[PDB]
Write a structure and sequence with these properties.
- Helices cover 49% and strands 13% of the residues.
- By secondary structure, it is of the alpha+beta class.
- The chain folds into three domains: 113 residues, 2-Layer Sandwich (TATA-Binding Protein), CATH 3.30.310; 121 residues, Endonuclease III, domain 1, CATH 1.10.340; 56 residues, Helix-hairpin-Helix base-excision DNA repair enzymes (C-terminal) (Endonuclease Iii, domain 2).
- The chain has a six-stranded antiparallel beta sheet with strand order 1-2-6-5-4-3. Strands 7-8 form a two-stranded antiparallel ribbon.
- Helix 4 packs across helix 15, helix 5 crosses helix 6 and helix 13 packs across helix 15.
- The protein is globular, with a radius of gyration of 19 Å.
- It starts with a strand and ends with a helix.
- The structure holds sodium ion.
- The site of sodium ion has 5 residues, from loops.
- The protein binds a DNA duplex through helix 5, helix 6, helix 12 and helix 13.
DNA sequence: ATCCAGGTCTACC
DNA sequence: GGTAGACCTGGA
Protein backbone atom coordinates (compact mmCIF):
# COMPACT_ATOMS: atom_id res chain seq x y z
CA UNK A 1 0.00 0.00 0.00
CA UNK A 2 1.12 3.59 -0.60
CA UNK A 3 0.70 4.74 3.02
CA UNK A 4 1.54 3.12 6.34
CA UNK A 5 -0.85 4.31 9.04
CA UNK A 6 -3.69 6.70 9.75
CA UNK A 7 -4.81 8.90 12.63
CA UNK A 8 -8.50 9.59 13.22
CA UNK A 9 -9.05 13.13 14.42
CA UNK A 10 -12.26 14.85 15.50
CA UNK A 11 -13.07 16.36 12.10
CA UNK A 12 -10.94 14.23 9.78
CA UNK A 13 -8.44 11.43 9.19
CA UNK A 14 -4.72 11.85 8.62
CA UNK A 15 -3.06 9.38 6.27
CA UNK A 16 0.66 9.04 7.09
CA UNK A 17 3.67 8.16 4.91
CA UNK A 18 1.81 8.64 1.61
CA UNK A 19 3.68 8.08 -1.66
CA UNK A 20 2.79 8.74 -5.32
CA UNK A 21 -0.03 11.07 -4.31
CA UNK A 22 -0.32 14.67 -5.52
CA UNK A 23 -3.63 16.53 -5.55
CA UNK A 24 -3.39 18.30 -8.91
CA UNK A 25 -2.21 15.10 -10.61
CA UNK A 26 -5.10 13.09 -9.18
CA UNK A 27 -7.97 15.55 -9.54
CA UNK A 28 -7.00 17.34 -12.74
CA UNK A 29 -5.76 14.44 -14.86
CA UNK A 30 -9.18 14.13 -16.51
CA UNK A 31 -10.64 11.14 -14.65
CA UNK A 32 -13.05 13.02 -12.39
CA UNK A 33 -15.52 15.89 -12.60
CA UNK A 34 -16.70 16.74 -9.09
CA UNK A 35 -13.48 17.86 -7.41
CA UNK A 36 -12.79 21.58 -7.19
CA UNK A 37 -9.47 23.22 -6.31
CA UNK A 38 -9.63 25.69 -3.43
CA UNK A 39 -7.68 28.94 -3.15
CA UNK A 40 -5.32 27.32 -0.64
CA UNK A 41 -4.56 24.33 -2.85
CA UNK A 42 -6.98 21.92 -1.17
CA UNK A 43 -9.67 20.17 -3.19
CA UNK A 44 -13.30 19.70 -2.21
CA UNK A 45 -15.26 16.93 -3.87
CA UNK A 46 -18.58 15.12 -3.81
CA UNK A 47 -18.66 11.34 -4.13
CA UNK A 48 -20.66 8.49 -2.65
CA UNK A 49 -23.16 10.94 -1.15
CA UNK A 50 -20.48 12.72 0.87
CA UNK A 51 -18.55 15.98 0.75
CA UNK A 52 -14.83 15.49 1.30
CA UNK A 53 -11.92 17.93 1.44
CA UNK A 54 -8.37 16.76 0.84
CA UNK A 55 -5.13 18.51 1.76
CA UNK A 56 -1.54 17.37 1.23
CA UNK A 57 1.10 18.59 3.68
CA UNK A 58 4.52 17.08 3.15
CA UNK A 59 4.22 13.30 3.29
CA UNK A 60 0.82 13.42 4.98
CA UNK A 61 -2.66 13.58 3.49
CA UNK A 62 -5.52 15.01 5.52
CA UNK A 63 -9.02 13.92 4.52
CA UNK A 64 -11.62 16.19 6.13
CA UNK A 65 -15.20 15.18 6.97
CA UNK A 66 -14.64 11.43 7.36
CA UNK A 67 -13.78 9.03 10.19
CA UNK A 68 -11.69 5.86 10.37
CA UNK A 69 -14.59 3.53 9.59
CA UNK A 70 -15.29 5.50 6.41
CA UNK A 71 -11.62 5.51 5.43
CA UNK A 72 -11.46 1.73 5.76
CA UNK A 73 -14.67 0.92 3.91
CA UNK A 74 -14.78 3.71 1.32
CA UNK A 75 -12.02 6.27 0.93
CA UNK A 76 -8.94 4.04 1.14
CA UNK A 77 -10.13 2.22 -2.00
CA UNK A 78 -11.48 5.44 -3.54
CA UNK A 79 -7.93 6.78 -3.68
CA UNK A 80 -6.65 3.32 -4.69
CA UNK A 81 -4.31 3.43 -1.70
CA UNK A 82 -3.68 -0.32 -1.56
CA UNK A 83 -1.93 -0.32 -4.92
CA UNK A 84 1.80 0.40 -5.12
CA UNK A 85 2.12 3.02 -7.87
CA UNK A 86 5.89 3.00 -7.54
CA UNK A 87 5.91 -0.41 -9.22
CA UNK A 88 3.51 0.78 -11.92
CA UNK A 89 5.74 3.74 -12.77
CA UNK A 90 8.88 1.61 -12.63
CA UNK A 91 7.47 -0.84 -15.18
CA UNK A 92 6.09 1.82 -17.52
CA UNK A 93 9.26 3.92 -17.34
CA UNK A 94 11.22 1.03 -18.86
CA UNK A 95 9.79 2.45 -22.08
CA UNK A 96 11.77 5.66 -22.80
CA UNK A 97 8.85 6.99 -24.83
CA UNK A 98 6.61 6.96 -21.73
CA UNK A 99 9.22 8.46 -19.40
CA UNK A 100 8.41 12.15 -19.90
CA UNK A 101 4.68 11.56 -19.37
CA UNK A 102 5.24 9.47 -16.25
CA UNK A 103 7.65 12.09 -14.85
CA UNK A 104 5.06 14.82 -15.45
CA UNK A 105 2.26 13.00 -13.63
CA UNK A 106 4.18 11.19 -10.88
CA UNK A 107 1.37 11.75 -8.39
CA UNK A 108 -1.49 10.31 -10.44
CA UNK A 109 -3.67 7.60 -8.91
CA UNK A 110 -6.73 6.09 -10.62
CA UNK A 111 -9.72 6.72 -8.36
CA UNK A 112 -12.24 3.93 -7.77
CA UNK A 113 -15.43 5.79 -8.64
CA UNK A 114 -19.10 4.80 -8.75
CA UNK A 115 -20.21 2.95 -11.91
CA UNK A 116 -23.59 4.70 -12.30
CA UNK A 117 -22.22 8.22 -11.86
CA UNK A 118 -19.29 7.43 -14.16
CA UNK A 119 -21.50 5.82 -16.82
CA UNK A 120 -23.57 8.99 -17.14
CA UNK A 121 -20.59 11.31 -16.66
CA UNK A 122 -18.68 9.90 -19.60
CA UNK A 123 -21.69 9.69 -21.89
CA UNK A 124 -21.79 13.45 -21.27
CA UNK A 125 -18.04 13.67 -22.02
CA UNK A 126 -18.35 12.66 -25.69
CA UNK A 127 -17.32 15.45 -28.09
CA UNK A 128 -17.43 17.86 -25.14
CA UNK A 129 -15.14 20.12 -23.07
CA UNK A 130 -14.39 19.28 -19.43
CA UNK A 131 -15.71 22.58 -18.04
CA UNK A 132 -19.07 21.90 -19.71
CA UNK A 133 -19.06 18.28 -18.55
CA UNK A 134 -18.52 19.42 -14.96
CA UNK A 135 -21.38 21.92 -15.19
CA UNK A 136 -23.82 19.36 -16.58
CA UNK A 137 -22.97 16.82 -13.88
CA UNK A 138 -23.40 19.40 -11.12
CA UNK A 139 -26.68 20.62 -12.65
CA UNK A 140 -28.02 17.07 -12.71
CA UNK A 141 -27.03 16.70 -9.05
CA UNK A 142 -28.59 20.03 -8.03
CA UNK A 143 -31.83 19.10 -9.80
CA UNK A 144 -32.39 15.76 -8.03
CA UNK A 145 -29.57 14.98 -5.62
CA UNK A 146 -29.62 14.83 -1.82
CA UNK A 147 -28.60 17.99 0.07
CA UNK A 148 -25.23 17.84 1.85
CA UNK A 149 -23.84 20.50 4.18
CA UNK A 150 -20.16 21.36 4.56
CA UNK A 151 -18.65 24.59 5.92
CA UNK A 152 -21.75 26.71 5.37
CA UNK A 153 -22.44 25.61 1.79
CA UNK A 154 -25.01 23.14 0.47
CA UNK A 155 -23.60 20.56 -1.94
CA UNK A 156 -25.67 18.09 -3.92
CA UNK A 157 -24.98 14.36 -4.09
CA UNK A 158 -25.29 12.61 -7.44
CA UNK A 159 -28.92 11.44 -7.89
CA UNK A 160 -30.08 7.91 -7.15
CA UNK A 161 -31.26 5.71 -10.02
CA UNK A 162 -34.89 6.18 -8.93
CA UNK A 163 -34.60 9.97 -8.93
CA UNK A 164 -32.80 10.08 -12.28
CA UNK A 165 -35.46 7.83 -13.80
CA UNK A 166 -37.86 10.73 -13.16
CA UNK A 167 -35.95 12.85 -15.70
CA UNK A 168 -37.48 13.51 -19.10
CA UNK A 169 -35.24 14.14 -22.11
CA UNK A 170 -36.06 17.82 -21.64
CA UNK A 171 -34.82 17.72 -18.04
CA UNK A 172 -31.42 16.51 -19.25
CA UNK A 173 -31.38 19.21 -21.93
CA UNK A 174 -32.01 21.83 -19.24
CA UNK A 175 -29.02 20.53 -17.26
CA UNK A 176 -27.28 21.16 -20.60
CA UNK A 177 -26.50 17.66 -21.85
CA UNK A 178 -27.16 18.90 -25.37
CA UNK A 179 -27.81 16.17 -27.94
CA UNK A 180 -26.68 13.58 -25.38
CA UNK A 181 -29.92 14.06 -23.45
CA UNK A 182 -31.61 11.23 -25.35
CA UNK A 183 -28.69 8.90 -24.59
CA UNK A 184 -28.84 9.68 -20.86
CA UNK A 185 -32.60 9.10 -20.74
CA UNK A 186 -32.35 5.79 -22.59
CA UNK A 187 -29.45 4.67 -20.42
CA UNK A 188 -31.16 5.45 -17.13
CA UNK A 189 -34.25 3.60 -18.41
CA UNK A 190 -32.24 0.44 -19.10
CA UNK A 191 -30.59 0.62 -15.68
CA UNK A 192 -33.94 1.19 -13.99
CA UNK A 193 -35.76 -1.74 -15.62
CA UNK A 194 -32.74 -4.00 -15.19
CA UNK A 195 -32.00 -4.65 -18.86
CA UNK A 196 -28.35 -3.92 -18.08
CA UNK A 197 -26.91 -4.51 -14.61
CA UNK A 198 -23.80 -2.56 -13.58
CA UNK A 199 -22.75 -4.85 -10.72
CA UNK A 200 -22.86 -7.78 -13.14
CA UNK A 201 -20.97 -5.91 -15.84
CA UNK A 202 -18.29 -4.85 -13.35
CA UNK A 203 -17.66 -8.52 -12.47
CA UNK A 204 -16.82 -9.46 -16.08
CA UNK A 205 -13.27 -9.70 -17.42
CA UNK A 206 -11.92 -6.62 -19.23
CA UNK A 207 -12.98 -7.51 -22.77
CA UNK A 208 -16.46 -8.79 -21.92
CA UNK A 209 -17.05 -5.81 -19.63
CA UNK A 210 -16.12 -3.46 -22.49
CA UNK A 211 -18.55 -5.16 -24.89
CA UNK A 212 -21.47 -4.97 -22.45
CA UNK A 213 -20.85 -1.27 -21.74
CA UNK A 214 -21.04 -0.50 -25.46
CA UNK A 215 -24.65 -1.69 -25.43
CA UNK A 216 -25.60 1.63 -23.78
CA UNK A 217 -26.60 4.43 -26.15
CA UNK A 218 -23.94 7.14 -26.15
CA UNK A 219 -21.19 4.70 -25.20
CA UNK A 220 -18.58 3.79 -27.81
CA UNK A 221 -15.04 2.30 -27.50
CA UNK A 222 -13.59 5.38 -25.77
CA UNK A 223 -16.41 6.03 -23.31
CA UNK A 224 -16.62 2.30 -22.52
CA UNK A 225 -12.89 2.19 -21.70
CA UNK A 226 -13.22 5.25 -19.46
CA UNK A 227 -16.14 3.70 -17.61
CA UNK A 228 -14.50 0.34 -16.98
CA UNK A 229 -11.18 1.93 -16.04
CA UNK A 230 -12.52 4.61 -13.70
CA UNK A 231 -15.33 2.63 -12.04
CA UNK A 232 -14.62 -1.06 -12.65
CA UNK A 233 -10.83 -1.31 -12.34
CA UNK A 234 -10.37 -2.98 -15.74
CA UNK A 235 -6.80 -1.80 -16.26
CA UNK A 236 -6.27 -3.13 -19.78
CA UNK A 237 -8.58 -0.32 -20.91
CA UNK A 238 -7.00 2.25 -23.23
CA UNK A 239 -9.44 5.12 -23.87
CA UNK A 240 -8.39 6.96 -27.01
CA UNK A 241 -9.83 10.48 -27.01
CA UNK A 242 -8.41 13.46 -28.89
CA UNK A 243 -5.53 13.92 -26.42
CA UNK A 244 -4.43 10.28 -26.24
CA UNK A 245 -4.65 10.16 -30.04
CA UNK A 246 -2.25 13.11 -30.22
CA UNK A 247 0.10 11.54 -27.67
CA UNK A 248 0.20 8.26 -29.58
CA UNK A 249 0.81 9.98 -32.92
CA UNK A 250 3.73 11.85 -31.39
CA UNK A 251 5.36 8.69 -30.05
CA UNK A 252 4.13 5.42 -31.59
CA UNK A 253 1.87 5.69 -34.64
CA UNK A 254 1.44 7.49 -37.96
CA UNK A 255 -1.05 10.39 -38.45
CA UNK A 256 -3.48 8.31 -40.55
CA UNK A 257 -4.00 5.41 -38.14
CA UNK A 258 -7.59 4.85 -36.97
CA UNK A 259 -8.66 5.18 -33.34
CA UNK A 260 -9.38 1.44 -33.21
CA UNK A 261 -5.86 0.65 -34.41
CA UNK A 262 -4.44 3.05 -31.83
CA UNK A 263 -6.45 1.37 -29.07
CA UNK A 264 -5.34 -2.11 -30.15
CA UNK A 265 -1.72 -0.95 -30.42
CA UNK A 266 -1.79 0.52 -26.92
CA UNK A 267 -3.44 -2.48 -25.28
CA UNK A 268 -1.02 -4.87 -26.98
CA UNK A 269 2.01 -2.87 -25.86
CA UNK A 270 1.01 -1.89 -22.32
CA UNK A 271 -1.12 -4.92 -21.42
CA UNK A 272 -2.52 -4.86 -17.88
CA UNK A 273 -1.03 -1.39 -17.34
CA UNK A 274 -2.73 0.17 -20.36
CA UNK A 275 -5.11 2.25 -18.26
CA UNK A 276 -2.29 3.82 -16.27
CA UNK A 277 -0.17 4.43 -19.36
CA UNK A 278 -3.18 6.17 -20.90
CA UNK A 279 -3.64 8.48 -17.94
CA UNK A 280 -0.04 9.66 -17.88
CA UNK A 281 -0.21 10.20 -21.65
CA UNK A 282 -3.53 12.08 -21.47
CA UNK A 283 -2.44 14.38 -18.65
CA UNK A 284 0.87 15.31 -20.31
CA UNK A 285 -0.73 15.90 -23.71
CA UNK A 286 -3.60 18.06 -22.47
CA UNK A 287 -1.66 20.15 -19.94
CA UNK A 288 1.09 20.90 -22.44
CA UNK A 289 -1.43 21.38 -25.25
CA UNK A 290 0.52 19.26 -27.73
C1' DA B 1 -16.30 32.70 -38.76
C1' DT B 2 -14.24 27.80 -38.69
C1' DC B 3 -12.36 24.50 -35.68
C1' DC B 4 -12.14 21.92 -31.38
C1' DA B 5 -13.39 19.58 -27.15
C1' DG B 6 -12.25 13.13 -22.93
C1' DG B 7 -17.09 10.64 -29.59
C1' DT B 8 -20.97 8.34 -31.00
C1' DC B 9 -24.74 7.29 -34.03
C1' DT B 10 -26.53 6.59 -38.66
C1' DA B 11 -26.31 5.41 -43.47
C1' DC B 12 -23.57 2.65 -46.64
C1' DC B 13 -19.61 0.09 -49.87
C1' DG C 1 -15.37 -4.54 -40.90
C1' DG C 2 -14.16 0.18 -42.38
C1' DT C 3 -15.97 5.20 -43.25
C1' DA C 4 -18.25 10.76 -44.32
C1' DG C 5 -22.17 13.66 -42.05
C1' DA C 6 -24.74 15.44 -38.39
C1' DC C 7 -24.86 16.77 -33.66
C1' DC C 8 -25.52 20.76 -28.27
C1' DT C 9 -22.55 24.25 -26.63
C1' DG C 10 -19.24 27.96 -26.24
C1' DG C 11 -14.38 29.50 -25.74
C1' DA C 12 -10.40 30.59 -28.78
NA1 LIG D 1 -23.31 2.22 -27.59
Amino acid sequence: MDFDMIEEKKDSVIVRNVENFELKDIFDCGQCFRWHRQENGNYIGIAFEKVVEVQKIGEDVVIYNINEEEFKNVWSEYFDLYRDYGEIKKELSRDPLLKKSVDFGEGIRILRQDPFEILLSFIISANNRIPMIKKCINNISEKAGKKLEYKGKIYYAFPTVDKLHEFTEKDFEECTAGFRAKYLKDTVDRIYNGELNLEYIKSLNDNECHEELKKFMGVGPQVADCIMLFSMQKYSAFPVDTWVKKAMMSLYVAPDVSLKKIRDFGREKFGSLSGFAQQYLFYYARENNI
